[PDB]
Design a protein around this ligand. Structure first.
Ligand code: ATP
Ligand code: MG
Length: 376
């Protein structure tokens, strides 16, 4: 009777898998898997076989770590080729009907059916509110008696069919079933406080190839997008600036990386190899932070451009930065120097996943739980 929730994040840098348990009104992580791969680029499958093997290896790792024979999983989908919009649907009753999870599922399904865009598929439909018998608004209609109808006013996330199909295919080629998919646009709602989600908060996830942006207000997702600029570009800038290899630039980024120049130490020194020579050059943390700060600043300017385009300039709920690149020192200080609102770095609380790169994978689990609770 043991119930586990397994999520998979097919990242450009690494595939991440989490095995979760419902505990103390939250999630207990009993196992994780992580595999760095080259099969994924810009959040999409670049080499099917390599990606497939990476996913398989990650599922194996999580299975060994948790002691669970993983057969069914929940898959996150990146905010790429994605559209967010509002839609309503209503189902009719011709006799007094006690509402249950099946009616909710039906009325939500109708919204999936309403989409007639051939290239895209609706992946998530989440209720904003319910209306019983055209007049009575409710948060949760279950166990209420409807005499005429049940309407839902919902948020909808649709994605390019090619992405959905390919990701699911790649995962299911590893001997597991994909139970459901969850867009990160929906997922990131879980890392926010009720206050943040109410006032108007912006989530910025800086990964390797992709930076994702999602805005929430009045307790619901408003809109989302992604930018093709993240950690890899920071590394590129380091490699170019220090005239070193990409590999060395990556290691240097982890070891001495700092995103705020004024706070970076010129007394903290390190040595680096050269590409066009056999000689070695010494650099300081401040020298490095010059390039790192320039790139991260550019990323945040891209984020501001997205917010301006979406008409979401007012961010009273503040900024919440996550993802692997949020591991960099000085990120919070830089963004705080760029905005008048509150800024924080989100890191999952559970032991084993206290790294910001896991934010998506854990959130996915929450998402699934939420729907489980909704369709009761
Ligand atoms: N301690 C650290 N300091 C600086 N950067 C780091 C650190 N740890 C990881 N990173 C960077 O984070 C990035 C990977 O983050 P993450 O795992 O969130 O990306 P992903 O989800 O695999 O890729 P994407 O979301 O872009 O498809 C890499 O660019 C890596 O260099
Ligand atoms: Mg990611």
């Amino acid at each position: 009777e043991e119930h586990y929730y397994v999520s998979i994040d097919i990242g450009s840098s690494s595939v991440k898998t989490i095995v979760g348990e419902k505990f103390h009104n939250g999630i207990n992580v009993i196992g994780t898997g992580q595999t760095y791969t080259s099969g994924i680029k810009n959040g999409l499958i670049d080499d099917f076989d390599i990606a497939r093997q990476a996913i398989k290896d990650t599922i194996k790792k999580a299975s060994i770590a948790s002691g669970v024979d993983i057969k069914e999983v929940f898959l996150k989908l990146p905010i790429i080729g994605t559209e967010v919009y509002d839609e309503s649907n209503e189902i009719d009753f011709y006799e007094d009907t006690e509402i249950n999870g099946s009616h909710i599922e039906k009325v939500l399904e109708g919204i999936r059916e309403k989409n007639d865009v051939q290239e895209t598929e609706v992946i998530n439909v989440f209720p904003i509110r319910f209306i019983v018998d055209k007049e009575n608004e409710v948060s949760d209609p279950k166990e209420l008696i409807a005499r005429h109808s049940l309407k839902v006013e919902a948020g909808v996330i649709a994605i390019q069919k090619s992405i959905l199909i390919n990701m699911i295919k790649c995962v299911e080629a590893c001997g597991v079933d994909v139970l459901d998919v969850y867009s990160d646009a929906y997922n990131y709602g879980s890392i926010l406080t009720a206050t943040e989600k109410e006032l108007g908060a912006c989530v910025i996830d800086i990964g390797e190839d992709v930076t994702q942006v999602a805005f929430y207000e009045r307790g619901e997702l408003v809109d989302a997008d992604s930018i093709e600029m993240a950690g890899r570009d920071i590394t590129d800038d380091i490699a170019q600036g220090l005239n070193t290899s990409y590999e060395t630039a990556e290691k240097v980024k982890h070891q001495y990386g700092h995103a705020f120049y004024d706070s970076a130490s010129d007394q903290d020194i390190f040595t680096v190899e050269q590409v066009d020579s056999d000689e070695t050059v010494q650099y300081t943390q401040k020298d490095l932070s010059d390039f790192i700060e320039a790139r991260v600043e550019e990323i945040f300017f891209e984020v501001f451009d997205v917010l301006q385009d979406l008409g979401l300039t007012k961010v009273n709920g503040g900024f919440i930065v996550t993802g692997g690149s949020a591991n960099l020192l000085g990120v919070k200080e830089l963004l705080s120097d760029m905005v008048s609102e509150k800024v924080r770095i989100h890191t999952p609380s559970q032991m084993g996943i206290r790294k910001p790169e896991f934010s998506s994978a854990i959130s996915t689990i929450s998402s699934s739980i939420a729907f489980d609770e909704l369709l009761d």
